Amino acid sequence: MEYVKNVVCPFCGTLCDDIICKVEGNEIVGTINACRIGHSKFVHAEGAMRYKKPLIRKNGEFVEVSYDEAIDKAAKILAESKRPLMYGWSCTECEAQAVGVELAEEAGAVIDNTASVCHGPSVLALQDVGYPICTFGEVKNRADVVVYWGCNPMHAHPRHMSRNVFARGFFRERGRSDRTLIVVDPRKTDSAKLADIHLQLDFDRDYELLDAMRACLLGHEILYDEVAGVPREQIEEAVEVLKNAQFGILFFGMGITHSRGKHRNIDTAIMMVQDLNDYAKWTLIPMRGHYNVTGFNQVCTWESGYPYCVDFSGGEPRYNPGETGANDLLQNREADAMMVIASDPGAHFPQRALERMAEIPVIAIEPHRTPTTEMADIIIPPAIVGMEAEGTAYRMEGVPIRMKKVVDSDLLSDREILERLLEKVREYKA
Amino acid sequence: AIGLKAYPELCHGCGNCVIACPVNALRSPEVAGGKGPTDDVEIIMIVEDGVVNIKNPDLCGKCGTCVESCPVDAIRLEEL
Amino acid sequence: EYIIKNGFVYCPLNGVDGEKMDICVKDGKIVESVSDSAKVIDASGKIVMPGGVDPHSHIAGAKVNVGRMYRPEDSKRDAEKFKGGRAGSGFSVPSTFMTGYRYAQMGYTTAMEAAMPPLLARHTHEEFHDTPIIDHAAYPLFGNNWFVMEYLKEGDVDACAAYASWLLRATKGYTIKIVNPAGTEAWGWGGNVHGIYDPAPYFDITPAEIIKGLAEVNEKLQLPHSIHLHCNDLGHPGNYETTLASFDVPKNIKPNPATGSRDTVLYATHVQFHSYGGTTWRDFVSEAPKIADYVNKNDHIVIDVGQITLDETTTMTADGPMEYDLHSLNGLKWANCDVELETGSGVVPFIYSARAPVPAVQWAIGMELFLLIDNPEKVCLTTDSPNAGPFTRYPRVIAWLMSNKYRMNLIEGELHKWAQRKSTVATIDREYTFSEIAQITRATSAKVLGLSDTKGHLGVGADADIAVYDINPETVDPSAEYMAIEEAFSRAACVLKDGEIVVKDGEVVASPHGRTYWVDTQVDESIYSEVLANVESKFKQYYSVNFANYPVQDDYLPKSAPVKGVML
Amino acid sequence: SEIILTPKEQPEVPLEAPNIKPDVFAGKSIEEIKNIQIMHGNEVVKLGDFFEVSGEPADAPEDIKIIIDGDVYNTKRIGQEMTAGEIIVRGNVNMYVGAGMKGGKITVEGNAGSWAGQDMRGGEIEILGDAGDYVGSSYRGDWRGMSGGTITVHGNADNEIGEYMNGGKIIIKGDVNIMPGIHMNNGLIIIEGNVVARAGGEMAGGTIVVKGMMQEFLAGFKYLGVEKDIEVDGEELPGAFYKFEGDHAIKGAKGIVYAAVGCNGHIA
Amino acid sequence: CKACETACPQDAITITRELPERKDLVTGEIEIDKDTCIYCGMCEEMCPVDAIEIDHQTPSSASPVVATDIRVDEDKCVHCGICKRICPVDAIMQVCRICPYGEYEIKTPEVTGTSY
Amino acid sequence: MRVILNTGRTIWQGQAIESGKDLKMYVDAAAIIQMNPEMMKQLGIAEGDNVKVISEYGDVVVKAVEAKEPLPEGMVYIPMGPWANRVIRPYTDSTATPSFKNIPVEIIPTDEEVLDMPTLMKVYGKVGQ
Ligand SMILES: Nc1nc2c(c(=O)[nH]1)N[C@H]1C(S)=C(S)[C@@H](COP(=O)(O)OP(=O)(O)OC[C@H]3O[C@@H](n4cnc5c(=O)[nH]c(N)nc54)[C@H](O)[C@@H]3O)O[C@H]1N2
Ligand SMILES: Nc1nc2c(c(=O)[nH]1)N[C@H]1C(S)=C(S)[C@@H](COP(=O)(O)OP(=O)(O)OC[C@H]3O[C@@H](n4cnc5c(=O)[nH]c(N)nc54)[C@H](O)[C@@H]3O)O[C@H]1N2
Ligand code: SF4
Ligand code: SF4
Ligand code: SF4
Ligand code: SF4
């Protein structure tokens, strides 16, 4: 058996890069250090469908075809389409994402990643009010106060707390004992169970709580005697905890991007972090979901100027989330075709968007059997980034780490599939 | 006697106990700093195949720190 | 091969000042003669200069893309799609393809990214790959680096030199950049340093000791370029004294490049922002004369100005504490990123309105610096792009320098009267020649960066990076027709990049990838092994990544172009 | 004066027609107007391809009256940046109706989508039906939004009307959802119906009037008491209003929310 | 006075009134010498308007004290003198100025409001 | 009973999606509704009993599970997935992001069966092309 070290895990935005892979033959049979989720990706579960070849639905029955036919049929769909949606991207590597931007350009497509169902609202907020962040290493070595706001890292970023809170840092040699841990969540989550402070606020009322907290912070009196289910007195006690930090980090997640107010919940949170810096060093990090959702928003931004919801229909890049986002085009029935790559909107879009996927050509570059492949017309299986293919990924706070190739696969990588898709879309348009 | 016992089927693989343990910290600077070990080291427990895995129970001093760090009671100090 | 005939050649390094003369090029090099089968480029009635060389711009990296991402309104004002090429957007911070195109349109062929955080180096190199045409390099940051601060406090300059050697190779970087030394580390706790004798928390080393020690390291590894200094106390009234004190610290260090012709130990960047008098913003006055005169009298310093362009633009720096202060002043959206053990950064929009008193004075300070410095070989043309303005405004900066009329029209019209009351700009009648502009846009930069063997000149042996501007110096008057000067330097008639035509009549016609210059240094085995053992120890304890995954892998440099420092 | 656009069957992939405005129609024969370019997805097409065109030409935009005699629910950007003249739509419109408008008047006889009057500078927009989100809003990332004009919605609107407003006036005679006046700097918002939550969230200046019921409000506002028979920006208001100043989560905030006393005792 | 608001059988009346702040009807000086203070808590208990606040704690070997600070909130203090009389170590200096300086330092209250 | 529906992650639903969304593991981890024990007794159901969840936007059958992460009174939890996304709020309020969390729903016990993954998707009626 072979032990491959320093492997980067291809699941969540923690992007752990200390994974040991156990390799038998040409196959990954075990892991060390990876959490329960990361391990499940690296190893094959018995009975689980791993598509060996492309597939196409001929009316009602899937048939195996070759790469050249599947890519050909997909290229024609996009070429003849007048509002194609190219969605996903977060679970592949950056060079494939770069090819996707060029392909969306060539097809006059809308290109969009899972940010539109995730921390997109944080993107909208940071575009309006700012983005005061730091890297994990400053948290580990400096953080005096650690807040998890509307995120549940024990279930969604399982090693996040061990690496950033329990870890012993340069100015924090005592690890957990040197930090006040705060969690804000209407549920007593397993993350909240470890907290020194658990603000079990009323759901959908974060914006109100943050308004009281900020008014208090700037010296004003809190109008009502209770906000978001938290009595006035503890609003003030919480603001004092933050003001007296030597170094504070606000980790936030889906509890405020998906909640009532969405991008404006992130907005008010950011500006409080900003204003806290007149009393104490303060910074925040969005708990980005997939291991490379951040990588797409980086690539798309630097190539086009915009991070997601990018519309190339006019040639020029244009950007207005709420119009040009995956769920906007699907639910308003604007999109006339959809290409999914490294994402599962069949499982993870709402009912109203799925109703539209039922009516339009759906292309799916996907290695596994999913609700999206059950709604797909063409299925194209690729080599999996981080296990069978290498490339750049971006951690939740922007740190670039290269994904490693551990074992070989006969399948093509996402990049090769997209470059062939791009060549023949040009062929049709000429 | 009281000893360390793992319940892997409840485990998240999160690594809090591995990092929280002072014996592990003392022997592995990376574990002390919140990382899984990449160096070969002999420590009390590791996360392996996604779950906590006891490798050297004789080094366990039954202090209780790991237990405090687990939110899902997957590692405990009990009889046997 | 190509022959470019009958152009008025301006090449200051070889002392050519407007002579009619043909330039011969073969296989990406400038040659003495070519076959009569060579293709002819007609430069009659036109100016011929070396490809431009920008020594300080922010075009590739994390700090840059945050500015792009959090300003969609900046993209909406200026979004483009050329027929042959890639779409792009961003007036103040353009996307990468637009960035390379627009350098090319104005005849620039080399541009250096001036501030790269080592941990984020892959990011910079990835954006470089998507930046067409221009040759490039990146400056890693050292002035707030934990290893540098710990080694130089013990006085161990040899160990710091070994660390730097490793870091420049690992990030594929080119110069020892220094931004607000010790102060950004103080910003890790929300503070700053004031003056060059104010130490950072814990590390207990002063700015002065950081600057001296790294100058010492710079020449001990025989780097092509000098230390590149962004001073403490940026942008605050009265800081001119901190600047002058800073300038003296490395003067007693002897320059020692192994490659190139650099003869200066200090490069001070965007010093307009470091030339402020007064004590608050209301008694704020220009102190550029004292700065300019220091430069005139001293031979160890080269500067760039950081000229205000009077636009709505975006500021982005490794000077974290300063950007928070700027956000405190103008109330506009603020981004920040502290990088573990390495540096920090901040991003804030700023409107340099001509009608406002403070931007008016800052515009004058930069003009004063260009004009009161007598020798162009000591100065470079910069806007600290985009901090003082987008690099697309270099032609307007040229026009201002070339025209007494352009300046007084702006001084006597839109510019707030503080430009006259609080500076000497109005009394300055000097106008730059076409030779002096070619010096500050090519020669000084190429020479001081250690690239003058192959860049910044039109002599035999140079790379075939050449710009032809549709200006006739015999018939056109720099002073009166300033808008023809601006328009012509904006859209070059013809540009060659490594012998290939990339621009024709202002339009981009080819998209080759440029080279990435980085510095190759070699240090004693024993010093090196011990430092790398110590470095790997702190990675295990204190970094958030693993040592093995940190250095930039070779696939991020398709066009690796190593330059030699000290070897053996 | 009157130029009639009769829509054909509207496509599932929407149209973008910024060029449907008096400024472009001026000085053009009927045939040249048929040949005006509009967008249909990623394809450039002609206005004639989706509209019949009749009526009489005119040389100046202020004398031009465009009538869209039919539903155009799937065409965006009608009247965008028009400076003069009038547009009347006998049916629904999509997004961006009158975005960036500087003068003239648009009347939508049915519903309008989101970003009606985005970045408005002058003129009038009247929407007889319901409106979407971001009535009279700014653009993403920009802190300078609507600076002038009048928007009147006779039905209901949704979220973030007047986002970053900086002048002008919005009147919603119906109800709004949440965050009306979010980040307001200047101007006037009058909501004649109800508000669910967060009126004036993070506003720095301007004035919001609510004549109906605010179900929830915000703790960063200071209660100043009651004012009777207030008059705002040339508009006369009868009755008494609870008066609040905020949002003091913002530094130097001087905005004003007036909430009618009859239905807002729980807010005080 | 709000009598009609109370009396109205239909709750048709709203009467508002802004009263002066407490600080503005009262005048005096108060200082606590925290070095003399031994943190017995008696002033905090006896203060009838809860103007005095003490940062109580459990001692540790690093911080071997039962409190880390004590403060008087002059927005609340009405200068009754109780704390200074009860202090066992005379660590509180307190003097009321109403009688000598009341005409000048305390403004006569204007009571504002509206009706509807 | 009217309750507030909250949705999101679970270590088991993450293990399941990386094992395989075609597997039984995934139905067991994502086709469930987590409830406080008092609420299950108020509804008269035990662990393993099925529940019909109906909202303004859809309906779904999920298996009732006792929450190990306590919920506020009146709230239930369905992990992210196609079952939860039958019923949560689709509208994005012009942000592109749907309202996946905190949705008023009606829950009632049912003897109907939980739909497995491919059977659930047929509700949307995919037409080939
Ligand atoms: N109710 C509810 N719904 C939600 C949410 C919620 O909280 N509640 N959350 C939302 C959020 S934040 C998100 S991000 C989405 C989930 O976003 P999704 O993208 O739907 O998440 P996954 O199901 O993990 O999909 C990733 C897919 O990529 C595939 N994949 C892995 N590696 C590779 C590769 O190298 N190449 C390619 N081509 N494919 C690869 C995997 O098999 C997997 O099917 O769900 C959203 N939906
Ligand atoms: N196991 C597993 N892990 C994953 C994924 C997965 O599918 N499975 N997907 C990945 C992806 S794409 C992402 S984006 C991340 C997401 O990581 P998280 O941000 O943690 O996402 P969620 O688990 O959906 O929501 C977190 C918490 O928000 C709380 N919440 C709900 N409503 C409110 C509210 O009104 N206010 C507040 N303050 N909190 C509220 C919920 O109680 C929940 O505990 O996880 C990633 N990791
Ligand atoms: S944490 Fe996110 S990343 Fe680190 S392992 Fe468990 S999953 Fe892979
Ligand atoms: S008990 Fe004390 S020692 Fe034995 S493991 Fe848990 S922690 Fe390490
Ligand atoms: S035990 Fe409790 S803690 Fe140690 S890993 Fe399994 S879960 Fe995370
Ligand atoms: S009227 Fe003014 S005064 Fe006469 S009662 Fe009602 S309130 Fe007291």
Ligand code: SF4
């Ligand atoms: S009484 Fe005198 S001593 Fe006891 S507390 Fe108040 S002050 Fe300190």
Ligand code: SF4
């Ligand atoms: S004086 Fe009377 S009131 Fe002012 S503090 Fe001492 S006690 Fe409390």
Ligand SMILES: [Cl-]
């Ligand atoms: Cl298990």
Ligand SMILES: [K+]
């Ligand atoms: K797997």
Ligand SMILES: [K+]
């Ligand atoms: K426990």
Ligand SMILES: [K+]
């Ligand atoms: K941009």
Ligand SMILES: [K+]
């Ligand atoms: K730092």
Ligand SMILES: [K+]
């Ligand atoms: K009454």
Ligand SMILES: [K+]
């Ligand atoms: K008391």
Ligand SMILES: [Mg+2]
């Ligand atoms: Mg905006």
Ligand code: NA
């Ligand atoms: Na630095």
Ligand SMILES: [S]
């Ligand atoms: S995500």
Ligand SMILES: [W+6]
């Ligand atoms: W996500």
Ligand SMILES: [Zn+2]
């Ligand atoms: Zn600088």
Ligand SMILES: [Zn+2]
């Ligand atoms: Zn700079």
